[PDB]
């Protein structure tokens, strides 16, 4: 499987946009969390399907597939969120009709912080002019790099997607040295996504215990990991 | 649930 | 300043080796946490001097200098632990007189989990044959990329260190494709450092709240922030 | 503490 086929495969594997409608009245602490948790659950279902399409994922042991998904689900959700907001500064496009302004994050206790770091990382991606093909590879890398003969098979899968990312960047045409620099700049942002993820999940558990919003089934299982 | 979606769907 | 000379300045910024002045003897839940916290405190002092020796750091606003160090300190401490443990498979070389075994982490609830994370990431750097100069660049990058006039100075510095890491990799004389692969592999491991980090502090924070570990001024402050 | 070490040598 060449880099180009791996990329095309990821392109086709892209999950369809989950449609969720913004509540009639202005957001309340509870209706915002309701909308966010409802979106996450539906996206989680598509995320599983997306994962099974990543070359070699299904060939890993069931327990590795589970550990990977439990460890990176929020990171993946937010990477997708940031990509969708790429061309909309100051705006977080959770979904087509779920466009949240940095301000509306005031009704929810402690979410404004998360919204800020998410907006910051998005601006950085925008500043770097992240491309669709690069984005696909990075999202797949996020899943495969969350290791937080199957173990060896994982290393080979990650190297495959990495080779694809290198291939994509080269097709941009920039100098060899600039390709290395772009690769570094993109990957250095995974730390920030992982960070926001940690705060995001911490915040969701907080909200659950506060009984601010009900969290069960899939979403809950992923939360506990 | 996670295992179900992974193996049953 | 060329990459080679930038790396030389990092080598010159390296903190001195630290010992906790402890006569060899078994570990208990109290003697371990006390040793780890006492070591962390001493290393924090040296970490501050190290950061100031990185070209341009003291040129940043006092606000930026403080924010960068308050958010990355634990990750920088763990990166150092991994580099010291690289040649000692199965062991965590916190310090010459503080060498811990995986089964000794069982004397402290919740830490065996973190040790496994650190030992795994360490084994990974061992597999990649992490070099000292890459270690230096990576450690500096952790400090400069932990951010969530002085702003562009920071970007310039982070870019300089990144250019230094690329240069280090280019000197190994390996294949160009293998240089890109290596750059991505080293950088992807940083997510695992930031992960063991957030876990390590959560554990430490819980410990502080219980007053199980003595009061250490700098550490207490770094922890609170 | 962090601040006084950042402004002294
Ligand atoms: N920010 C934030 C935040 C806080 C929280 O408690 C739960 C969530 C869930 C999400 C979220 C949901 C769907 C996405 O595609 C991306 C992020 O963001 C959250
Ligand atoms: N693992 C772990 C862990 C858990 C904890 O409660 C406190 C600490 C402190 C450290 C620690 C101390 C010095 C280092 O150079 C690196 C890590 O590791 C800890």
CA distance C78 to C83: 9
- Distance from the Cα of D4 to chain C's closest Cα (Å) equals 10
**A5: Cβ contacts below 8 Å, ≥ 6 apart:** none
**CB proximity D7 to C under 8 Å:** yes
Residue A175 is encoded by which pair of tokens?
Answer: 């100098």
Q: Record the tokens describing residue C111, joined without a space.
A: 């830490």
**Cα–Cα–Cα angle for A187, A190, A192, rounded to 5 degrees:** 130
Q: Which domains does chain C have, with CATH numbers?
A: 1-225 (1.10.565.10)
> Is beta strand C98-101 parallel, antiparallel or unpaired with respect to C91-95?
antiparallel
**Ligand with an atom nearest the CA of residue A46:** 1
The beta-carbon neighbor of D1 closest among C62, C65, C217 is C217
Nearest to B2 among A49, A52, A221 (CB): A221
Distance CA A68, CA A81 (A): 20
CB A93 within 8 A of CB A84: yes
Q: Is there a contact between A221 and B1 if contact means CB atoms under 8 Å apart?
A: yes
Closest C-alpha residue for ligand 1 atom 12: A40
Method: X-ray
C33/chain A closest Cα distance in angstroms: 24
User: Shortest CA distance to A179 belongs to which of C224, C94, C70, C183?
Assistant: C183
A40 alpha carbon to ligand 1 midpoint, in Å?
A: 7
Q: Which ligand has the nearest atom to the CA of A20? A: 1
Q: What are phi and psi of C28, to 5 degrees?
A: -120, 175
Would you call C191 and A159 a contact, using CB atoms and an 8 Å cutoff?
A: no
Nearest to C194 among A177, A184, A195 (CB): A195
Q: Is there a contact between C177 and A166 if contact means CB atoms under 8 Å apart?
A: yes
Cα separation values, A113 from A3, A106, C69, C144, Å? 38, 10, 19, 21
Task: Name the closest ligand to CA A35.
Answer: 1
Resolution (A): 2.2
Q: Flag whether residue A69 sits within 8 Å of chain B, measured between CB atoms.
A: yes
Distance between CA atoms of D7 and C30, rounded to whole angstroms? Answer: 35
Q: Which residues pair with C100 in a beta bridge?
A: C92
By the CB < 8 Å criterion, does C180 face chain A?
A: yes
Gap from CA of A200 to ligand 1 centroid (Å): 6
Q: Which residues sit directly before a break in chain C (C to N > 2.5 Å)?
A: 148
Residue C109, SS3 per DSSP: coil
Residue A214 falls in which region: left (phi positive, over 0), alpha (psi -120 to 50) or beta: beta
User: Cβ neighbours of residue C159 under 8 Å, at least 6 residues apart?
Assistant: A181
CA C207 to chain centre: 21
- Phi first, then psi, for residue A214 (nearest 5°) are -80, 135
- Cβ–Cβ of C52/D6 closer than 8 Å? yes
Q: Which residue of C lies nearest to D3 if distances are taken between CA atoms?
A: C66
CB A7 within 8 A of CB A136: yes
CA distance A210 to A7: 42
């Amino acid at each position: 499987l060449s880099p180009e086929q791996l990329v095309l495969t990821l392109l086709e594997a892209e999950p369809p946009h989950v449609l969720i409608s913004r509540p009639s009245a202005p957001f309340t602490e509870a209706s915002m969390m309701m909308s966010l948790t409802k979106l996450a659950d539906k996206e989680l279902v598509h995320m599983i399907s997306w994962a099974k399409k990543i070359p070699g994922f299904v060939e890993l042991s069931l327990f590795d597939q589970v550990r990977l998904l439990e460890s990176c689900w929020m990171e993946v959700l937010m990477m997708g969120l940031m990509w969708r907001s790429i061309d909309h500064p100051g705006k977080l496009i959770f979904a087509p009709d779920l466009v949240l302004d940095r301000d509306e994050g005031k009704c929810v206790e402690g979410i404004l912080e998360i919204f800020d770091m998410l907006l910051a990382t998005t601006s950085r991606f925008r500043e770097l002019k992240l491309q669709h093909k690069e984005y696909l590879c990075v999202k797949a890398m996020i899943l495969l790099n969350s290791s937080m003969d199957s173990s060896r098979k994982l290393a080979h899968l990650l190297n495959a997607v990495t080779d694809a990312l290198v291939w994509v960047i080269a097709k941009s045409g920039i100098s060899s040295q600039q390709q290395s620099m772009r690769l570094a700049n993109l990957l250095m942002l995974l730390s920030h996504v992982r960070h926001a993820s940690n705060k995001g999940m911490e915040h969701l558990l907080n909200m659950k215990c506060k009984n601010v919003v009900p969290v069960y089934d899939l979403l809950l299982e992923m939360l506990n990991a | 649930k996670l295992v179900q979606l992974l193996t049953t769907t």
